[PDB]
Each structure stands twice: as C-alpha cells, then as structure tokens.
Scaffold this motif. Structure first.
Motif, mmCIF file in Angstrom:
data_model
loop_
_atom_site.group_PDB
_atom_site.id
_atom_site.type_symbol
_atom_site.label_atom_id
_atom_site.label_comp_id
_atom_site.label_asym_id
_atom_site.label_seq_id
_atom_site.Cartn_x
_atom_site.Cartn_y
_atom_site.Cartn_z
ATOM 1 N N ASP A 155 12.804 3.664 -11.360
ATOM 2 C CA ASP A 155 13.620 4.762 -11.956
ATOM 3 C C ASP A 155 13.143 4.922 -13.424
ATOM 4 O O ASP A 155 13.395 5.918 -14.079
ATOM 5 C CB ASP A 155 15.118 4.393 -11.951
ATOM 6 C CG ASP A 155 15.717 4.320 -10.531
ATOM 7 O OD1 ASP A 155 15.394 5.213 -9.772
ATOM 8 O OD2 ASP A 155 16.475 3.396 -10.264
ATOM 9 N N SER A 156 12.472 3.904 -13.893
ATOM 10 C CA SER A 156 11.881 3.772 -15.276
ATOM 11 C C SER A 156 11.273 5.056 -15.720
ATOM 12 O O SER A 156 10.554 5.620 -14.917
ATOM 13 C CB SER A 156 10.755 2.823 -15.311
ATOM 14 O OG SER A 156 11.105 1.952 -14.255
ATOM 15 N N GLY A 157 11.562 5.473 -16.922
ATOM 16 C CA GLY A 157 10.981 6.755 -17.437
ATOM 17 C C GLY A 157 11.815 7.998 -17.077
ATOM 18 O O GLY A 157 11.628 9.054 -17.675
ATOM 19 N N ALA B 124 7.466 4.537 -22.373
ATOM 20 C CA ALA B 124 6.159 3.962 -22.800
ATOM 21 C C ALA B 124 5.758 2.847 -21.853
ATOM 22 O O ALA B 124 4.576 2.628 -21.659
ATOM 23 C CB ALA B 124 6.252 3.367 -24.211
ATOM 24 N N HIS B 125 6.684 2.149 -21.260
ATOM 25 C CA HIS B 125 6.200 1.095 -20.382
ATOM 26 C C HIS B 125 5.735 1.643 -19.023
ATOM 27 O O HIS B 125 5.404 0.865 -18.148
ATOM 28 C CB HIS B 125 7.262 0.028 -20.174
ATOM 29 C CG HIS B 125 8.428 0.404 -19.298
ATOM 30 N ND1 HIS B 125 9.564 0.884 -19.685
ATOM 31 C CD2 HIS B 125 8.551 0.319 -17.940
ATOM 32 C CE1 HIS B 125 10.351 1.082 -18.685
ATOM 33 N NE2 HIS B 125 9.747 0.742 -17.592
ATOM 34 N N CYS B 126 5.710 2.944 -18.889
ATOM 35 C CA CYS B 126 5.249 3.561 -17.626
ATOM 36 C C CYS B 126 3.785 3.978 -17.853
ATOM 37 O O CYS B 126 3.127 4.451 -16.955
ATOM 38 C CB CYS B 126 6.051 4.786 -17.301
ATOM 39 S SG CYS B 126 7.649 4.380 -16.612
ATOM 40 N N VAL C 224 15.359 5.862 -18.677
ATOM 41 C CA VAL C 224 15.580 4.561 -17.994
ATOM 42 C C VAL C 224 14.529 3.600 -18.635
ATOM 43 O O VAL C 224 13.336 3.849 -18.554
ATOM 44 C CB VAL C 224 15.344 4.749 -16.478
ATOM 45 C CG1 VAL C 224 15.563 3.397 -15.782
ATOM 46 C CG2 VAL C 224 16.308 5.793 -15.899
ATOM 47 N N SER C 225 15.004 2.549 -19.223
ATOM 48 C CA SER C 225 14.127 1.563 -19.901
ATOM 49 C C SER C 225 14.159 0.151 -19.345
ATOM 50 O O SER C 225 13.167 -0.257 -18.770
ATOM 51 C CB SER C 225 14.545 1.620 -21.401
ATOM 52 O OG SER C 225 13.664 0.812 -22.185
ATOM 53 N N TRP C 226 15.238 -0.576 -19.507
ATOM 54 C CA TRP C 226 15.248 -1.973 -18.961
ATOM 55 C C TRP C 226 16.627 -2.461 -18.610
ATOM 56 O O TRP C 226 17.584 -1.707 -18.624
ATOM 57 C CB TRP C 226 14.642 -2.931 -19.985
ATOM 58 C CG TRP C 226 15.304 -2.985 -21.376
ATOM 59 C CD1 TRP C 226 15.137 -2.077 -22.368
ATOM 60 C CD2 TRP C 226 16.102 -3.972 -21.831
ATOM 61 N NE1 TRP C 226 15.846 -2.565 -23.372
ATOM 62 C CE2 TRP C 226 16.466 -3.709 -23.150
ATOM 63 C CE3 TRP C 226 16.572 -5.129 -21.201
ATOM 64 C CZ2 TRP C 226 17.298 -4.594 -23.838
ATOM 65 C CZ3 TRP C 226 17.407 -6.011 -21.890
ATOM 66 C CH2 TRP C 226 17.766 -5.740 -23.200
HETATM 67 ZN ZN LIG Z 1 10.870 0.001 -15.574
#
Ligand SMILES: [Zn+2]
Ligand SMILES: [Ca+2]
Length: 223
Positions: free
Chosen positions: A176-178, A39-41, A191-193
């Motif tokens: 790499d997030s998501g 979601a943060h992507c 991949v989140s935080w």
């Molecule tokens: Zn990220």
C-alpha cells in the motif's frame, strides 16, 4: 490493506499502481504528468498504471505510462524514513476522465480525529501474505500526536502522523506504500511505515504532505 473493503471499480480515480513486472507500490496522481509516492518505493524501470481496479486483468480504462524521472526528496533518510516522499514525472500526460483524475494537495494540515480514506493493493493479512487483485479501501482517523508518539517513542518526526486503530485489525500494509491517505478531498498522507500490520497499539505512520506542498510545487515547476 488489512480489514478493509473492496472499493468498487474506479471509485478512487487518483490511485495509481507502480509496476515493474508486478505491483510493488501505490501512488497518487496530482496533475496529468506527475504522481506522488513514497521515497522508499524508488527503483528504476517504473511503469505507472492508471485506471486500475483488477491489476491482473485488463478490463478497460487502464493507461500504462512509463516514468520519465523519479525525484526522491533530497533529505530522505532510509533508516528513519523521515521525508518519505517521491515525485514521479510521466513520459507523456495521462488522459484525465472520470476514471483517471488527480487529487488536490492540501492548503493546511488535517486535525486529529479527521476521517480519511486509505486504499491500495497491498497485503491483506497481518499474519501471512495475501495480495488482492482489486483495490481495497479503509476509512481511518488521524490520531493525536501524543498517542502516535506514545506508540512509537523517538521515531515520529514532525513530517509524520499516525492514522488507524489502536485495537488492531485494520491498517495499511506492505504494498500500500506510496499510496494515498485522502481527507476531505485533499491528499494529506502517503502510506509510509508501521510495526507489522494491524497490530494492537502500532498504528500506521504516514508522510505528512501538508509539510511538502511548497517543495512539490517548486520541484514540479523546475522539472
Ligand atoms: Zn512500504
Ligand atoms: Ca486491470
């Protein structure tokens, strides 16, 4: 990915690059028209790039499809990053083949100690920024909840798990997030935080996908 290795072209056929003029996040193909990411992507103007290895060169096998809609989990909290999952529906279905394939959703959660494969085109420096042209891979284990909570007291919810190395030097990072965390052929994490990247005693935190399978299925079924 910090401390990882070059995967090899198309050896992670479910990995996608979310692009808005540059690569900004990863994602996983779960069927021919849907991708799961973080979601943060979220942002508008997302083009999903499938069959990639070098994201800066068209080498063949790539399929560029626009996102028709992005569904951020309704209970996503951007301050705690709880429920950090997003579904992306493609404008048209992708042509699945051996270079573009989907990954299976899990039926049960994974245990601590399970070895997983994390990949992506994110930063490769803990100190500094270097973004790779080709896909990087890292094999990392899921840590126990006590070690995870001891590393991030009060910030770990039941929808998160830690994976990595407490000695530092190997981890996923910004970019790499998501993307996928695959264990025994099932997508177990996103991949989140994490605090910095590859820092000692600060493992990466991932969205615990087994907690969202019914949500994913019901949502895809109604869209
Ligand atoms: Zn990220
Ligand atoms: Ca390419």
């Amino acid at each position: 990915i910090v401390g990882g290795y070059t995967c090899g072209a198309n050896t992670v056929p479910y990995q996608v690059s979310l692009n808005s003029g540059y690569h900004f996040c990863g994602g996983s193909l779960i069927n021919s028209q849907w991708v799961v990411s973080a979601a943060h992507c979220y942002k508008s103007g997302i083009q999903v790039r499938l069959g990639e290895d070098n994201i800066n060169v068209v080498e063949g096998n790539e399929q560029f499809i626009s996102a028709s809609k992005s569904i951020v989990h309704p209970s996503y909290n951007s301050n705690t990053l709880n429920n950090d999952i997003m579904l992306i529906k493609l404008k048209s279905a992708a042509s699945l083949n051996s270079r573009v394939a989907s990954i299976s959703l899990p039926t049960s959660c994974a245990s601590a100690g399970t070895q997983c494969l994390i990949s992506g085109w994110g930063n490769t420096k803990s100190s500094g920024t270097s973004y790779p042209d080709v896909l990087k891979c890292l094999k990392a284990p899921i840590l126990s909840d006590s070690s995870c909570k001891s590393a991030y007291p009060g910030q770990i919810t039941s929808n998160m798990f830690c994976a990595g190395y407490l000695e530092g030097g190997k981890d996923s990072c910004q970019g790499d997030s998501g993307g996928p965390v695959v264990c025994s052929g099932k997508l177990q994490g996103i991949v989140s935080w994490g605090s910095g990247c590859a820092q000692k005693n600060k493992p990466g935190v991932y969205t615990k996908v087994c907690n969202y399978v019914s949500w994913i299925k019901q949502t895809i079924a109604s869209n």
